[model samples]
Target chain A: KVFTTVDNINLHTQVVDMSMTYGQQFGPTYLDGADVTKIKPHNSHEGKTFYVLPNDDTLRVEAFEYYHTTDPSFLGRYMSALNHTKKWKYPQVNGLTSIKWADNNSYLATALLTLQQIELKFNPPALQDAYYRARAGEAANFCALILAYCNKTVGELGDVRETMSYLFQHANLDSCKRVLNVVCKTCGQQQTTLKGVEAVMYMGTLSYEQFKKGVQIPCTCGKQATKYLVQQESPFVMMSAPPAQYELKHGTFTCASEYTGNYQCGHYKHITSKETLYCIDGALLTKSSEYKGPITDVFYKENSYTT
Target chain B: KVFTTVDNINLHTQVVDMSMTYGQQFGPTYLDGADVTKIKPHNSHEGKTFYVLPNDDTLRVEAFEYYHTTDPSFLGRYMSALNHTKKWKYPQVNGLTSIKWADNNSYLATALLTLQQIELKFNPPALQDAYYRARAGEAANFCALILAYCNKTVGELGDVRETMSYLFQHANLDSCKRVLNVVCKTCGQQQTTLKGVEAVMYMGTLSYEQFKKGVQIPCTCGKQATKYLVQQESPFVMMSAPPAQYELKHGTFTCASEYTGNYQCGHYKHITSKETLYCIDGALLTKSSEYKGPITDVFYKENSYTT
Candidate 1:
């Protein structure tokens, strides 16, 4: 009942759409012919291309895929920067090249920057460490989509709820600056680094679910966060709610509930008024077709239901 | 009528539950224990990191974000080659770290090897460049979601469309090999790309009245292909029968019978099956407080009592 069917349609479309925004940004760019071509993935010859500098400390770069018959030296055509230089001019270099310093903050952005820097900074161990550090930025960056959605939603005419946990997904470098351009919008900030890959896996779901809801999780878990599932069919599951706090990691898990409080059957199995109707048909067919109740609440004649 | 509202609650729940999968692979060396606190989504970054040589060559790697960024070093850590040569004490090292080059492609399977190699050969361009390129894969990836819906409608289920696109997004490397998996499972080989974003902005919606259930577009720009848009709304008067496709760059235009395609109709005025209703308590009512387009169509207006 929290969302109408149409709302679910809209929400799912938006979440999935948001997940895809990164590729969209890149998809059209390639189409416009920026001389972009897809390169293959590599494995054998891994790492050892970037570095974080001690002095001025920007992650340097140089990178090549494992393709040739032999290890090619840094001698190849490469760009000094990954192209996001407040001033990028595409200067070419050998064995190494790049300009942008890896961002030391977020993982994905820095990773992206690190990858770019690797083409230029083939420094020793310490710098190499920094390069990998920024590499985190590239492989895990996702602020643009979140901020863009927040900007769009702030102007909406519905009852809006923004949470702190959700903000991390949508909040980005520019979010603070442009938070007020739209409708009923309030800003909040919370910082707590959740720990462990298992916890992080759950956090991942909560963040996306929040992005989909355009809200933030209320719990403040510097290390012990909770996760709420926001699947499309059962669109009301909160990824994080009245739950314990958490840390961050890079992995996935099958998580469901998160709370330090006692279980409220009415609340825990919080199937909305309409979710049953909408999904009932599928539920019936699944029972009729497979009809097993291992960990399933889907069997016919709901043994627990009072017919 | 298209999607029968079945009462199978189980199937519906499956869709909800199976919407996303969670699993982990690779090593777990955490930096600051607080950062490595949990694995659930709320506790973790939002993406999956693969220690990949994400470029044209495999020797060098710049990490890449697969899903969300729960971990800063997702790409650098999870998807890496474990230095297994030293029988007992070998651990996974992200990127091409301090491992001897003597190991053959033994530990690394062909699929993983090829995938890694592909990632390295073509490092991601700058984020700006990467974002859009990321779109093709995203849209195509979402095509999988669409396929799921379509498959369900056809009584055959499995959504490969969006997933395929997702794979493509990550399959920049090992395209041929990855494609082998794709072609084997999909009719995609025969199916062509949606052509281009240009079609979304094609200037062909000027004949609002002439709009029928189906119509073809006219563009010699070979890329301009034929696509139909069903009337999403009733009046859809000004929009084409199949809403006109507009190139994302160009604006979307609609052709009503009134205007013949010179970029007309900023209005959503459609040829609605309009019927003025006579409410029971109309005279005494100020503004239908309990009305939000009538809960069901039956309550919309007197079913057949005409004026």
Candidate 2:
């Protein structure tokens, strides 16, 4: 909900009280009730009334990548992956096919055109293949890239899709892997057996002819084969599933001295590489090492964490 | 020049005189010079004032196809081919790459999106090839098709562009000829050796491999060589030029028994087809059946004619 504002004023600011008469509220909220005749009186001062919002380095800005999933099944898969959650919390679906930065109405049209130009460069099926193998975080970056592209083109004035079907038709697994390696590097995480590693390896190691022949890649549980969904119009990774009609893969992490140069549990406030470690109750507290336990039991502060 | 209008009111019309005095001469053209504020009392009537244009089957509505060409060279070829003149009259170029249907501000944005969708279907080279083979009339059809597609898709909101291109690409001599057979059937004209017949036959007769190998087809006059521009981003057809550069091909019809099916010339109220045929001042006219000769020596309706 990071709305854009010019000068110091946000025109969309909520009205706390509309009871003030037009001339009485003329100081700050003059614009809200001013008619044509009223507005004409202060027309000369209109340009000077605005001021720029001062920049502050202290306030942290979190960037978000918004993606529109056409399939209704996507949110279902996402919620399930989020762990057996009931009553889906669907993101606001405001009848928008894409996101706009501000009140710029022409932005969407311009972005779409730019996107088509970019799509025209690569073969549709090949680009789709590239998207299918992309990791979740990498997919976010891909989404962000499209927005930036649109932003750039609209300023000038531009906008692909496709779905997951076959391995080769989606995207190159290696390229998607390349993007993730860079994105994950910022987190100081290890590469050994990451989430989807097993699935990635399964698809990547398959022979080219194997994919072309349409052979199903299955899990050891002898259940449904793994499948994926990509943003059909562009190389935008959305979701991947190991197989339907089977148990979900609660991914595991093996090595840790790797997530850090030496084993250091920031949450547990302890450091040790001597014992094997594992996450418990959503905390990174290792299974070994002194005070390596759940955040609630070991630390009075009860800081939240992620495995 | 063909602008769209709703009912009889041109929404795009501009007002000139806004003299405050309603009946004060108002430039001696009072009705057209009517003031807005002065006529405010009757403003409520304005809403009910509009009336739909009455339908008239006998009005003889003429269809127009407007083309917006990206390159400057397009109009030159079109005008020269339209022929019997010199010193080109080019439209003011504003560096636009697409066409707009009317004065609506959103018209450019919408048309461009439609054009891109059409452009997206064929790689640049393929699209350009379609444009290249496209005759003047066919180009108009192509332009019209893009607008029609935009209208249809923007209505339901979805649309692809390739299949139509293939039809033109696949059929060479016979396909184009087939269209004229029906269009010109009313004129009783034959198409055995129409304009571009030599070149069409040459290219059409070439084995597919011949084009793949990049060979050239030539007319005996050692005339214009075929030139093509392919999309660097895609193999889209953008432009094509014929062999002979300066030679103007003004086509002529040697025989026609039925434009009216009775050889009646619209210009000369005559009903005979035995007169010698010729053009006068670039106007297509024939010597009368009862009075057969060139206008210079014949009837002093004295209407001058072409050779």
Candidate 3:
């Protein structure tokens, strides 16, 4: 096999370069004040900071969302889903936790925050349920997010780690999902689902006890399962999952999008009749048509791919 | 002058070291990213940014309107002014246009994107004269903000002279002031000023231009012209100043508070009432209680403090 050239290696270099004069290339990071003295062992900037850059907008932007996986084996399936998705190439390890940060710097921060939140949101078992269910492409957004944050962080700041056992063993995965959602919204990530079609439904409405103790929300397809990671915060959604013994039956649906005060369980994702069972990627999802936010809509206006 | 002995110097050094190392130091900054390696320039923890600190809270979460002074020389004074007001004192220079990375990393490949909007709502120097002549001490807020942004960027960042100087002269001063009043409501510096028992003749309303033609806001209050510096990137309230003022006037008073849409001719310092001009150190002014907005009680909140 032919040897790889220096230029070829540079293509895979995720982090940008600036401080070339430093005798040693990447410097070890240490504690300082608010600013990190170093990015990690190898990457550093100019003068701790240089006021100016040649052109500052070349770096990529990223976003992430993750949920819990209960069964240890489920982690493999989740990672596999991410591995198989061709939305974006990973460039590195398929299952590494920290590698998720590679796509963007902001995305990395958002992802870690999500992880800590996951630790807080759900109990051990619920989290496990989520973590496992999240595999099989059920939690595409979450899996993609973890990988994204890991990639970016590892690329510049060096190795950041977490044990798969701990992550999978302890369960409430929604916390991570909520955290990622917040950052995704704040930092200008696209919201593909429409505001109107969002809804929540309770199964077992036919029985007398079912009315009092409504089970899972019927996942629009007439199934008794609420959508996961679709809320602004955990408080906004119905946290109580149906019991294992509860059998799902007919259900009633309502809109419940407000997260300002107490959780109002009376809403569902806004979608047209035709758009059921399928979600649009970054679309306005109104009754009329598809629409992304400012950036995307402008790029592809009137359904004509101008650019 | 009494000098310490060598023994005393050594002992003093130890004390100083102890105080600084494990002490409650405020302001001035020490950042981990300074090393520009290992830690990375931008390190974000959770959704919140884990900024390495030069010290604790020197960022000066203060009540000063626009960082104390808008004149180009009062930067030091403003930084000094931060400690007493607002809760957190940011590390020195943390507020400047440094490369605020997405998180902490030695290799800060990503830079935070902050955009500045430059627009000319309208221009009428004559109206500013009326505003100043009638109001006296209301323009200081605008000036102080200008200086704060300018000095921080020009002096601290070591930018080019021509660009800095150009910004100093051309920034959209009043609109900048208006936005500041809106976004950073009570975050500006404040000093109790005795309200002058003033009265005004009920006059018919006129356009900002007509009012300027009639009323003239003045600047020669003989108040101390407190000077301060501003950051170059976000140096001014307005993105850019009017290209050329052929119509007339220099410092038009634009409504930034209750008087959002109102304007004075070149009378930036409106002080016609019998109110004591509790004005800025210099070149700044405040409107008497008579100022009104485009709509009644829209900008005029009931519980607003009369400065």
Candidate 4:
């Protein structure tokens, strides 16, 4: 049985024991014959999934993977600037590393970058016309256009994401600066501005289940440039930078043949020596509390057993 | 005709106009047939008599004469000691000038002086026994003794004032030191120590009629040094160093030979060039609002007159 539990991203119930350093003391133990190429999750669903990493960098990877746009040039400058700012770890990204993905992590900082100068620099005639119109309400402003993109309030354009697809493919110093500005701004706003009346309203507006673990949602659109979205209540639309990396030994892992890519029965959950006590008190301990299935291998009945 | 209102010391209802500087703008106006040999009080009383002075030194004279010891040696020592203290004003004292008598002043400083040292010098057997006995409560300390002498609480001694009469007779460098200490200590206590809880209770206890004009209260006792007392709530027992003298070209006019020395039945009051404003609305304008006596001059009740 190489499967444990599968749950939705919104119902974040996964727990990662932080008692010891993640890679050094816990996580899946390496086996010679076992196929462990990547950290295969034990759970997956139609929506986003969640991952629990004891290290902060792993969470950042999870944030970046789920957040980075598909526009390769834009992506390159982001990673390049990310490397220059001396903030991100493993900055040398050549598209070879398998990026961890996450829809959200409590640690992730995000912001809305007003793209006035960026759009002005690119100055596509179509964009220029739209911009001028936006000022006079002759056309929808960025705030209104983006909201409409999310299938929210409709605008003059059917889908702003499709309409503004050309700008994402381009890259420049300002573009990267804007991204970093969003990163720094988001962190700062979280620390300061999100304190008073905005604090309550901001928290109340989002009822998404939060947990100590991070969750992931992929860009299935497979567009050349993914259109990222933030809260509807928010005015600016921009992607989040991964939280700063933590100093943990970095290694990649893949699942073995029997890998269910799930904590319930994953061949690559964590590398730890303690016997997996899946069954205790006449019941099997599943990956998440929501998981329930028939116990096999007599993992549970009337006796306690260790994996 | 020499006296006006004869009232108790506590019943002080007279007011002095202090708006003008006492000796300068207004004070002790001279008289021709006025019998104004000195600044005699226009008013006198039974319980305790009051005198008004345009000069602060004049009040000091009133206090000294009304409160000095007849023993010339004692008076000499008090004045001699008064000269040494840097706290004293014009610290040179001759037989003619009077001394300020205040165990404490709002400005005077004081300390116990821990007479164990001073006592050793004098080494008087009687003083030593009294000091020890005071510690034993079989005798009273000076502070306690003085309070008891005021008929406050009776201590072992019958008449402490009479018992301690001999100390005042002696004069020396030590006496000056004591005076300076008293001056400094009194000021310090008034400015600092009385600021807390004691201030409220002390202020509340005093209903002494306040005045814009300074009043002189002389002791009626026929003793050499008539004892002067302040409020029980007052932390200090001291003589006011007369209100400063002001110079405003002194002028005076006695009663028109029929002056009763009072407004009650006086020909009139206030001999000055300032116009006499009487007979306004058929009533006389008097020196004070409290006056409603007969107006012999008629200066007659009629219209407002200009000087």
Candidate 5:
């Protein structure tokens, strides 16, 4: 018997006696000394085929053939079973080997791939498809989770794979969720929990534009609050004073006048109507008449009193 | 008389008579026909110099010379006063002219410079010095405000001058203050008022590193709260779960045993001891004896129960 290796597993090949004369020795012997074509070839063990060959004159057997079967040795079976039962087994690639046995969801696989600098590829073309496949337990999901949360494809993330890979390996889904918080400004409400892809959407590394696009939460005030509304809640944002109005006292003028003369009664009187001006944060506004220029221009042109 | 313009304001120059015999009663006239050296030169109006010279024969006056003085016309003085009293004025460069008269603190100057694409430079070497000068009323403060708040120098801001210039021009100190808000994380307290440079320190444009370095607000808990502590309060941050401990129940084993056999007492029995294992977030910890490997290794090597 001889051992042959296929798919990194051992298979045993042995020469077997195929002649019918072995069971009926007194009967006519059917051994052909020179006719090799008289022997028939057949497959038996696990559909492995074998061809019967004419035995040599010095051999004890009448006819002999080679046959293949799984390795029957205890140590060989032990090794095969150990590799077969792994949760994350490698595909039968000619030169590739897994660093360790790891689950698809566990960080152990991510760490091994990162340490070895192995670039993972998806069978499906799209990242979304890959993510769905991972959810269905058809592929490794940690890398997919990173790609989806970061809003980047493998091509874009390839440049900084080492750093991102290491970060995700050491940090679990909960760690990513802890780095970001979302709140509502109108009613002073906050998001309570994040699940699956939602945890990654609000990562601190996301840009304001991305955050605005990805987030959709409503305030208790029945208003659809967005990143724009909640952005001011950040500690980095500055609080401002309430809006104020300034009166342009000097902009007021006697725009119109009515002269009442009583020549016959020997008395005369005149009444004038003045225009009041106002502004808010430097923007000019008029109550009665039009101002032809900006508030700054008005102030520059005349001694305007702004209160 | 001739009018010469200086600093965009007019100065008047005139020929003056230098003959001493005109006032004297036919005394020896001192008008030299060819001796130009006798001409006495003198500066009269606002340090403007003039020279005395011989007059032509057909001239109505006796010996005459040229002299200069500031334009004394009413309109000329009005224009000069208008330009001189401005809070922000243009320097006397040969070809440069200000788009408008603006105050050092007001946004009007920033707007005009932005609309005209004018790049502002600081007289002092450092941005900090420029900011100090602006606060001290020595320079235009809007540009300096942008530089100091954004933590960039004039040269570094030059590339994006148009955008930043426009933003600051339309945005006042109060507007910038409204864009950011700083809070303490230890206690749920927010900063009330932002003053001077403090308003700009917490601007959204600042990076975490820069924010940490520039901020120094203390929490009500008496701890020095920085950007790191306050960062989690931002809406963009994610909330996370608390730590959990896992016990390796199956790692319990018959470690050592004192064989106290009761053969002499007619009973054969022995006592044995076991070891229990525990882990927190996948890290292994032992209470009594040392474990030689990581929690993952122990779990993989044995049928360990992790809870």
Candidate 6:
């Protein structure tokens, strides 16, 4: 319905012209003029090229060949074929264009268009096919762009696979909160779910200051619901566990930090109270702060953080 | 006096021939007719070439140039020049020749001859200069060959410097025993010292099995006096010091080998006499073998050896 009657008539006339040229010598089996689809206009700097799908599969192939021979512009030919096959609406506008549609279909079209712009600017045909193949269903355009940006930054696709998987599985609120183990601390009401495309739009509209505070959503009781628990399960904070400590009842205090041959163990008394304490090498101090001796033990505590 | 009248007459004649050709044109200052040395014959596969050093330094340079133009064999020119300059006695009676003399002069000649043979066989002209430069004083011939052999084995001359220093300082008993800390354990008589050349000859004459038993020399008291002490000093035996142990009077027993969280510390009783012993982490057991407990500590003694 986006294509008018004049455009349909022009595409039908081009089909008749192609049928007359090849249909007579090669017979009816080669070209069929019965099914003439509407013209899909591909707008570029050099002008416009129209594309149509004929009834016979052989004629359709011949139609591509005929248009390629006449036009010969690689970008024009590719865009025209893609616009016709996918039924993408390219409105006649000035300057750069942005794709507008509701579903994932429009997202895929925008991703392919972006890839085309990249190929045209940078002129790397070898990398174009690889970038196109990295598309996903939920956030097809965003995923492709992410992969392309990651490839440029990291220089290796294999190294960014973990990051890709993390983003891919957590683009929406339902999946992101579930994987991050987010919950409501007060009212026990979960945050409303969002699709990947809508989540991307919501994140893009937020300020840098708002992003630093994290993705906050309202609950049924009108409070910030999604609060992450302080746990050690996420991929970002995974590290080796802390070393175990053993208590000593009565032992000689010896500092393992410095080497003093065989004279590392000794008895010391508190300067103020005169309370004596014996310590040996590798011995742990229980009441370290209370004992104000010359040799003090260094204590390291385990690190803790929230998501 | 080793050179006869015929050899002298022939050399004098060659000097006249050079003088007649270059002396008259370039004036009398160019080639000196007097101070004609005895002829030094260089034998090769092509034939023998004679060399003589004239009185003047200008004449000597011209003689080298004249002989080089006439007979251009690199080996012949080198050998003849070396023999004539150093006044070396070369007996012409064999296929492969060896220089015969008593002192270091003959040693240098032998070393150069060996290097010539290596260059001829391997055909590496670049490495010839490096091998020639690595020569030392006492054992000049052997030192050069050692460096050449080390260069071929290690592929780098810098890595074999320590080995070169060790051999250079200790080719004889005087320097060797002083560095090795060799002393008389019994009658207090040191072994007789020998020169580096004599030491090399003595070492070469011994059988493989006899050499493996170590270099032995009798003292003035008719006893083996050069014995090394079991001291911890030498480049070969240098390592980190052993971990110090701290003795405990009364502590809980803990094995540092296996990790059991906080339960690594415990008390153990001897099976035979029921003697209770308490040990904790980092505590050393004084009488380990005497107490036959279930939790036995693994002890690592410090290594000891003689040079």
B1-307, model 5: which lDDT tens digit per residue? 1122222122325443434222122211111111123333223322332222223332212211111112223212222222222324433111112213221121223222222221233322232343344334343333433433333322221212233433333222332221223456657646354322233322222123334343555566755665322221211111111111212233332211111111111111111113332211101122423333211101011121111
Candidate 4: deviation at residue A152, Å?
19
Candidate 1 lDDT tens digits, B1-307 = 0010111111111111121222221123222111221233232333322122122222122222223223344322221211121211111222211111222211111112112212222222322232232232221112212222122211111112222233334323332210001121222222222211121111334332222222353233423233343222221111222323322111122111111121111111111111221112101111221222211001011111111
On TM-score, the leading prediction is 3
Worst 10 residues of 1 chain B by lDDT: B1-10
Candidate 3 global lDDT: 0.22
Chain B structural similarity (TM-score) per candidate: 0.16, 0.19, 0.18, 0.16, 0.21, 0.23
**Candidate 6 residue-wise lDDT, A240-273, digit = tens:** 1111122212222211111121111112111111
lDDT of 4 by residue, B118-158 (tens): 22211223333444543343322332322222222211111
Q: Candidate 4 on A1-307: residue-level lDDT in tens?
A: 1211111111333343333222333232111112122333233322223222223454334333433323223322222222221221111111111112111100010001113212233222323443454333332222222222222221011211222332443222132211101112222212112211121111111111210011232223322221111222222222111111111111211100111221111111111011221111101121222222221110001111111
lDDT of 3 by residue, A269-300 (tens): 21111322111111112232332211100000
In angstroms, how far off is A36's CA in candidate 5?
99
Q: What is the C-alpha lDDT profile of model 1 across A113-228, one tens digit per residue?
A: 22332122322232234344333432111222222223321111110113122332321212111010111223333323222111112222334334333343423333232322
Each candidate's lDDT (Cα)? 0.21, 0.22, 0.22, 0.21, 0.26, 0.26
Task: Report the candidate with higher lDDT, 3 versus 4.
Answer: 3
| Residue A140 of model 3, lDDT score | 36
Rank ordering of all candidates by TM-score, starting from the highest: 3, 1, 2, 6, 5, 4
Root-mean-square deviation of candidate 5: 40.4
TM-score of chain A of each: 0.15, 0.18, 0.21, 0.17, 0.20, 0.23
Can you give the DockQ of every candidate in the order shown?
0.01, 0.01, 0.01, 0.00, 0.00, 0.00
Per-residue CA lDDT of model 2 for B1-307, tens digit only, reads: 0111111223212222332322221211112112222342233333232111112321112111122223333322332222211111211112212222211112222222223222222222323433443322123323323333233211111111222222223223221221111113224322222221222222221122222233343323333233221111221211112111111111211111111111111111111222343222111233432322211001001011111
Q: If you assessed candidate 5 against the hidden native complex, which CAPRI class would it receive?
A: incorrect
Error of model 3, residue A172, in angstroms: 7.5
Model 4 spans > 4 angstroms off = A1-121, A140-157, A170-174, A177-213, A217-307, B1-307
Residue B20 displacement (Å), model 6: 99
